[PDB]
Write a protein that binds this ligand. Structure first.
Ligand SMILES: Cc1cc2nc3c(=O)[nH]c(=O)nc-3n(C[C@H](O)[C@H](O)[C@H](O)COP(=O)(O)O)c2cc1C
Ligand SMILES: Cc1cc2nc3c(=O)[nH]c(=O)nc-3n(C[C@H](O)[C@H](O)[C@H](O)COP(=O)(O)O)c2cc1C
Ligand SMILES: O=C(O)c1cccc(CCc2c(C(=O)O)[nH]c(=O)[nH]c2=O)c1
Ligand SMILES: O=C(O)c1cccc(CCc2c(C(=O)O)[nH]c(=O)[nH]c2=O)c1
Lengths: 313, 313
């Protein structure tokens, strides 16, 4: 029985990795994720300049998942580029670098500088499109023309295979439109579904108060709340983007949750909230649990079941 | 006690009602809701003509909620109109009729017929903006120009105060645009937030299969999965629509959940999945539990806390 994967010209011991934003902001974090039994890691979404992010409390977790409005706190692109170029031990596992510029121009500037390092060290780009552009306009991936512009500009500036981190969608028309945009861009080799379910609101009954300070308490949802939404998006894009990989993210707490992602179409499986809550020991548990389901079903490899969710009649 | 309230020129014993679609399709279902302890009832969303809906299984529930692709099965507008005109006992509680035509013209045709009944009997209209997927275009409430058309045309045709059933939004710019549309229409006196979270996908690990037959397993999510989404939409519209009422729907299983909806801004609180799962006895329990939380906090009225969720700093 094996969890090994080969994609994007890299080898991966197993499909599990952190989700961007979790356990990946500092050099300490990235060393920790490297030391863990995950098959890969991704660095925190970065901007050109370092950011403090939003005031605290800006993350909170609960039995059914988490809410956050972190505000993109990060150490700045130069830091993550140096990590990828000089610090990361690529003999341990592959590295993804997540970028999330606040304008197309900022993204272009970063990718131009990433490219030689991607070429020479093999660091892989994850471009976060589930992010803000202009206040009063929707996030980029919810604005299809903006999304097309970002991908045209980053494809030209980078010129190397990359992937994109997508928000969840809720309307089949959006699945159709979004996947068609992505399919215009041959350098988009993987699609990560999904980022948080946007602008939820958690209220504490006792205090009668929201639980995060930014945005009057509104923030992105992760965790148990979002698994079916995550699965739908993985499968929607898996069906619609046959020449790309899909990575799954959302609601993974167990090997069974990972198995469901993989049946939906996931290649890599990212872990956000559950990793935030449990710490990097989760990876050995998820590995064991996934191998146990495979053994019971007689599956020897991931490809024997990836994308093989059955439909009814 | 007591949880009695007045809205929309009607008196309600308590703020609870079924969510459209649950326990409200047949005359039997409507008489069952009327006999319950709910403060109101709403009928199944109807078309001009009867519909069988989609193939079974088309609804499934789980510990965290439900998924459905019912396909708008209903007995047709003439049936619900006759129920409102002739069979409903308005001495028991108010009745809302939900309408979900597949075009503007079909809604206009139904609402012109409903108007005299509304005048004579006081039946209330909930206009459902969600609809079956049509390839090439989004649902009506995710197309702000189509939504504006629908409300212009229904406003003109109906001429009386009515409400609208909204899908969830996930983006602050969308809240701003949708609320601005709604505020163009003075006859829209209530907004019901939210319909199911669209196009989720539940997979059964043992069978390696989706759990509903239509749409390759994709369907709307309700229950525990969607409470924070529902609260955010309730509050977003409560803040943006000061001259309207907001009705909360999504994730209510307990009086605590109702309390959170009301803190967010809800006037009425609708119950879908938990009603489907527990049956109409749930209303006595929700009432008792809400009144118990009120008493422990010192609240004598719903108005003392409606909309009074606290923010940080
Ligand atoms: C604290 C926190 C920080 C996050 N920061 C990022 C980020 O910087 N870039 C991004 O692509 N996603 C970010 N996310 C989203 C996660 O990557 C992930 O898509 C989402 O949490 C869903 O997965 P989950 O259900 O495992 O949490 C963040 C999530 C959390 C909880
Ligand atoms: C079986 C079923 C049928 C539904 N049919 C309708 C409908 O006809 N019209 C409507 O506006 N919403 C309909 N809904 C959505 C619910 O009214 C409600 O918005 C949703 O289930 C979220 O509430 P909950 O979390 O309490 O389930 C239906 C929901 C279910 C589960
Ligand atoms: O700066 C923000 O307001 C903001 C809001 C939503 C998303 C982002 C991008 C970074 C990010 C964050 C974050 O840093 O808030 N949180 C998530 O759950 N996913 C993400 O992609 C930034
Ligand atoms: O026929 C459908 O695929 C469909 C999809 C979404 C919405 C509707 C309208 C009726 C409805 C249904 C339904 O009857 O399937 N289910 C819900 O959760 N909300 C609803 O508003 C019908």
């Amino acid at each position: 029985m094996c969890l090994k994967l080969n994609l994007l010209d890299h080898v991966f011991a197993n499909p599990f990795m952190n989700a961007a934003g979790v356990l990946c902001s500092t050099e300490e974090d990235l060393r920790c994720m490297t030391a863990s039994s995950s098959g890969a890691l991704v660095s925190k979404s970065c901007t050109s300049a370092p950011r403090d992010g939003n005031p605290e409390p800006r993350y909170m977790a609960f039995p059914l998942g988490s809410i956050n409005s972190m505000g993109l706190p990060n150490l700045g692109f130069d830091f993550y580029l140096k990590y990828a170029s000089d610090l990361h031990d690529y003999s341990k596992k592959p590295l993804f670098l997540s970028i999330s510029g606040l304008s197309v121009e900022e993204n272009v500037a970063m990718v131009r500088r990433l490219a030689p390092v991607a070429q020479e060290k093999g660091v892989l780009l994850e471009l976060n499109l589930s992010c803000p552009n202009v206040p009063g306009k929707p996030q980029v991936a919810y604005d299809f023309e903006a999304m097309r512009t970002y991908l045209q500009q980053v494809s030209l500036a980078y010129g190397l295979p990359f992937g994109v981190k997508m928000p969840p969608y809720f309307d089949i028309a959006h699945f159709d439109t979004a996947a068609a945009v992505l399919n215009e861009f041959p350098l988009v080799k993987f699609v990560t579904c999904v980022n948080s379910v946007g602008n939820g609101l958690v209220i504490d009954a006792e205090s009668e108060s929201v639980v995060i300070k930014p945005k009057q308490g509104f923030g992105g949802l992760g965790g148990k709340y979002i698994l079916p939404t995550a699965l739908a998006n993985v499968n929607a894009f898996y069906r619609r983007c046959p020449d790309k990989l899909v990575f799954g993210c959302g609601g993974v707490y167990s090997g069974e949750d990972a198995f469901l992602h993989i049946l939906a179409g996931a290649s890599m499986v990212q872990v956000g909230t559950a990793l935030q809550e449990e710490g990097p020991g989760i990876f050995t548990r998820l590995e064991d649990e996934l191998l146990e389901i495979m053994a019971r079903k007689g599956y020897r490899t991931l490809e024997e079941f990836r994308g093989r969710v059955k439909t009814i009649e």
